[PDB]
Enzyme design. Sequence first.
Site: not given
Ligand SMILES: O=C(O)c1cccc2c1O[B-](O)(O)[C@@H](SCc1ccccc1)C2
Ligand SMILES: [Zn+2]
Ligand SMILES: [Zn+2]
Length: 232
Positions: A84, A86, A88, A149, A180
Amino acid sequence: GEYPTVSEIPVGEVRLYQIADGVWSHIATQSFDGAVYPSNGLIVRDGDELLLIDTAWGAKNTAALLAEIEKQIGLPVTRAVSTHFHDDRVGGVDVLRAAGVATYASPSTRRLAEVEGNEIPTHSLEGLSSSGDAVRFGPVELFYPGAAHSTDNLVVYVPSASVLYGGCAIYELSRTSAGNVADADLAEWPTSIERIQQHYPEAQFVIPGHGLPGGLDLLKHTTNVVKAHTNR
Ligand SMILES: O=C(O)c1cccc2c1O[B-](O)(O)[C@@H](SCc1ccccc1)C2
Ligand SMILES: [Zn+2]
Ligand SMILES: [Zn+2]
Ligand SMILES: [Cl-]
Ligand SMILES: [Cl-]
Ligand SMILES: [Zn+2]
């Protein structure tokens, strides 16, 4: 234990974990909103080459990932898929590209990455825009389960090893509250998870986007956590 955890991985280092013959996860750590999180991706042997699933959450980590792959496996990474939009999953795409990796994502992911200002994988994965769609990508199958997600999240199945990589749509068992969810579709997420169950009921190893692998029991667990958050 055996699977690497945050306490074992300073930010900037990457570990590999062999899941099955020709399948590894990669594990990195990153700072986010005052805490450190672990994060998983996948590596799948593709003949005498390697297919990479997801970056290691940033340029420095992704450079370390490529170095660890060369040290421990020693085969060239020729293609990568980001599951996706984001950081990570795409943070570090430019490092992959500079290293000669052909980077891929769906048009949905590429559109959302551009809007957001995240790195944009170069090549497009067609045939994945409708929930339930699956396409072959060498030694894996890519599946779009529906919004969860994120609206673009893909899962990856390695048929030779019965490994299902769920990415951030699947939570590890020890996560009992939502991660998140800023870009999530809470209303659809359980329905999307059930599509994964119906399509890959033979899966033996299920890898979440963050944390410990398990089996298919991670799916109903994720639904239970998402439903609880829905009802907050
Ligand atoms: O996967 C999870 O739940 C998760 C938890 C903590 C940090 C992260 C996580 O994955 B992700 O892809 O959402 C990302 S933050 C994506 C994001 C940041 C800022 C504003 C909106 C969206 C890194
Ligand atoms: Zn994400
Ligand atoms: Zn994540
Ligand atoms: Cl190419
Ligand atoms: Cl549960
Ligand atoms: Zn190319």
